[PDB]
């Protein structure tokens, strides 16, 4: 039972366990969200088929780890899908020739939020897969673990909907200008969606936000978002209606807002977070 990664790195055997680095391409689907498909990037074979007909199974206890350790889903395995983490030993995959074939596994996630996502960083842990090997012949049984690491930075969605970008930067033209904000929302199934604005407001109406400039800050001027002329205060929901696979622009615009009397030139900055809620 030899193996190697997508980048050609042979996965060591000889120590009880291993570290594996793979490329993650999460995508939102209906009911499930894909995390990683190891059919693309793990290839195993049998260097001495005449002498053995190996089997491999995903022993119970295999689970998400690292930052995903609290999540649950399913695992595609050898022709069928089972719940994940595994409460029981799965059926047996068979390796009986020197020719490589993929490790037919893929990990899914049961949505637990609206939009939302947890940021994976390269060199982090993804999941711990307890594996059990056996054979036709030598009355000989082993177990070994593969720690699954991501070698590329991604964000793993946890809701039924995704957005164009997680971090967005918009450069206001000089006072008193405004700009459109390129944000859009799409959902794999026809869903309702709203959103409310999170940030450190500055005013009594909670509609304007304070400057955060760390260098020669301007004073008396704060940001104020609006959609088609609607002032969208903080901690308030604005509904998108029914959202499907067609991405919907939030309709947000970024403005200046005059707070507290006289003004002084200088930089201006404000960081805003958008949260989505099912409706």
């Amino acid at each position, epitope marked *: 039972f030899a193996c190697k990664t997508a980048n050609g790195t042979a996965i060591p055997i000889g120590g009880g366990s291993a570290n594996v680095y793979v490329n993650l391409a999460p995508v939102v*689907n*209906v*009911g*499930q969200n*894909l995390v990683v*498909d190891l*059919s*693309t990037q793990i290839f195993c074979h049998n260097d001495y088929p005449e002498t053995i007909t190996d*089997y491999v199974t995903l022993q119970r206890g295999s689970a998400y780890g690292g930052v995903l350790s609290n999540f649950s889903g399913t695992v*595609k395995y*050898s*022709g*069928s*899908s*089972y719940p994940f983490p595994t409460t*029981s*030993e799965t*059926p*047996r*995959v*068979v390796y009986n020739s020197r020719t490589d074939k*993929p490790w*037919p596994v*893929a990990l*899914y996630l049961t949505p637990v939020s609206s939009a939302g996502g947890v940021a994976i960083k390269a060199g982090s842990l993804i999941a711990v897969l307890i594996l059990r090997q056996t054979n036709n012949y030598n009355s000989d049984d082993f177990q070994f673990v593969w720690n699954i690491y991501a070698n590329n930075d991604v964000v793993v969605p946890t809701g039924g909907c995704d957005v164009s970008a997680r971090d967005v930067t918009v450069t206001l033209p000089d006072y008193p200008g405004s700009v459109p904000i390129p944000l859009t929302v799409y959902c*794999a199934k026809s869903q309702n969606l709203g959103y409310y604005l999170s940030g450190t407001t500055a005013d009594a109406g909670n509609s304007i936000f304070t400057n955060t400039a760390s260098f020669s800050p301007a004073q008396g001027v704060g940001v104020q978002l609006t959609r088609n002329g609607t002032i969208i205060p903080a901690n308030n929901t604005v509904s998108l209606g029914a959202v499907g696979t067609s991405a919907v622009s939030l309709g947000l615009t970024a403005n200046y807002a005059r707070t507290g009397g006289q003004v002084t030139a200088g930089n201006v900055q404000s960081i805003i977070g958008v949260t989505f809620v099912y409706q």
Partner: antibody
Amino acid sequence: EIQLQQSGPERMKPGASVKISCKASGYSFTTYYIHWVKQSHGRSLEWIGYIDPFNDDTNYNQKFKGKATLTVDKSSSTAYMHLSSLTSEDSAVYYCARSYYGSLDYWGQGTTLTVSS
Amino acid sequence: DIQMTQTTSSLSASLGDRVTISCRASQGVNNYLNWYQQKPDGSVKLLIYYTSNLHSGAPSRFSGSGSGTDYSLTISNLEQEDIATYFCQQANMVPWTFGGGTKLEIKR
């Protein structure tokens, strides 16, 4: 609900090649496997193979691998069963079936193939 | 391959009875064994999966149990709807295999 709608009965000469389809609906087409099963006219059930409708990986029963072939169209959520170089024995009923937890939890209505001269 | 087998091809049952159908596996399987029911119309359905689990929608009078190389299905009280053929299939090791089938008759 989950339903697998197949094409109507076929009738081909020996030596022809036929293509059955199975239009899945009611669930995420890419998140589950699809299997194909042959019920010969002895009424015994036989297993052909599976295809993953996300990456199009297939495994074929050793009995048919040189004769059958599975393919998928992700856009329309439709799978296809193709069988070539027909003969008398290929007269049977063919089912497209989902899979979950080691079980074929939903089947199609079946498609009758007649290989008649 | 795995040569699944069902003990009897035809079961001369009678209404109200408690019939049990048992199949054997040529080698053990970790309880990955399923029960299917085919009506005379030809349509096939899944009854029970992983040796004791009732599929979502099946009648709540079907039961299964067994340990590697010995499994069985039981109906508590026959209804006329239950006259059909029954197959068991192992999903442990590819290629998946089915049994010979057992047809459910009425005695008279």
